Amino acid sequence: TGMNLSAEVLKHQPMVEKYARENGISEYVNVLLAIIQVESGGTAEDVMQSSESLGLPPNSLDTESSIKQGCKYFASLLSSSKNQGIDDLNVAIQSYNYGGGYVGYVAGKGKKHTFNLAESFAREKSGGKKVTYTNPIAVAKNGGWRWNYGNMFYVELVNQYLTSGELAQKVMNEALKYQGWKYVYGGSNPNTSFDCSGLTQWCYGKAGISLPRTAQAQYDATQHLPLSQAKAGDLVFFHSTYNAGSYVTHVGIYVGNNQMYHAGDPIGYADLSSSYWQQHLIGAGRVKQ
C-alpha cells in the first residue's frame, strides 16, 4: 500500500540532492528521502539516523552531517553490492537498517534480497528472540512480530514511499529548481527569485499557460472547485494571510494529498492539514487549457 512523502521530509530534498550528487547516487534521491521518512519523519536533527553508521551514539549528528553521512553510507552499500555481484537495490535499502553484513549474507545466497533472507538474518542475529511489531504490514504477514534485530520489514516500509498530468509535471519540474530559495516580494523570475504569484506565473508560463501577475487576478482567471475535487497542477488560494486590499492574499500549486508547493519562505512544500492553512483556505482553481 503506497504512501506520500511529508513536507517535513521534502524540505530536506535540496540538501539530499547536493550530497547524493557528491556521492554519485543522484538517481536514488527518491530512495534517500523515503529513508528519511521511515527513519525520523524529517523532524529529528539526525534526519537520516546515520550516527550509528559512523560508530557514534544515537542522534549525535546535525542535519547537514546526517544527510552527508547517510548519502555516503548508502553509496558504500551500493559499492559493496556491485563488488559482491549484487544488482538488487533492495539489498542496499535493507543493509541501511541491518548494516553492511546483510550484503555479504545475500551475495552468497542468491545475490537478491528476499523477505525470507531478511527474516533469517534477523533470526540469526537476534538469537531466535521475537518482539511485538504492530505495523499493519507485519500484522497481516505473521500476526505482528519481528525477530529482535533491525527491522525485517524495512524494504517494504521504504518502498511504501516509492510507488499527475502533463501540466502538473512541467509546472513542478520548473518549480522544484527554486526549492529552498528565499522569498522576494515582487519577484517573478529566477534572477530576482519569487513571491507566491510570481512563482506560479513563471512556472505555468514555462508549461505554456499564461497567468496574470497577482494571486487575486490568478483566482479570477480560474474555474473554482473545492480542494477535495482538486488535482495536482490546480492552484490553491488563501485569504487574510497578511494585511492586503484583496480577498485572495496567497496562492500555491496543489500537488495532491492535501499538500502544496508555494512561495513560501523558503520556497517549498507545505502540509495543508495544519490549523493555520485550514483557517485561511478559500479553495482551488483550475487553469484554462
Q: Which residues bind Cl ion (CB under 5 A)?
A: 128-130, 221, 265, 287-288
Nearer to Cl ion, 130 or 182 (CB): 130
Nearer to Cl ion, 111 or 286 (CB): 286
The DSSP result for 169-187, as a single string, is HHHHHHHGGGTTPPP-TT-
Instruction: Indicate the residue whose CB is closest to Cl ion.
Output: 128
Nearer to Cl ion, 18 or 239 (CB): 239
> Nearest distance from residue 262's CB to Cl ion, in Å?
7
Q: Please give the span between the terminal C-alpha atoms of the chain, in angstroms, as a whole number.
A: 33
> Nearest distance from residue 143's CB to Cl ion, in Å?
13
Q: How far is CA 207 from CA 14, 59, 175, 211, 214, in A?
A: 22, 43, 11, 11, 18
> Nearest distance from residue 130's CB to Cl ion, in Å?
4
> Nearest distance from residue 98's CB to Cl ion, in Å?
18
Where do runs of H (alpha helix) occur along the chain?
A: 7-10, 13-22, 29-39, 63-83, 89-98, 101-107, 115-126, 136-142, 154-158, 166-175, 196-206, 215-220, 275-280
Contact 237, 284 (CB under 8 A): yes
> Nearest distance from residue 261's CB to Cl ion, in Å?
12
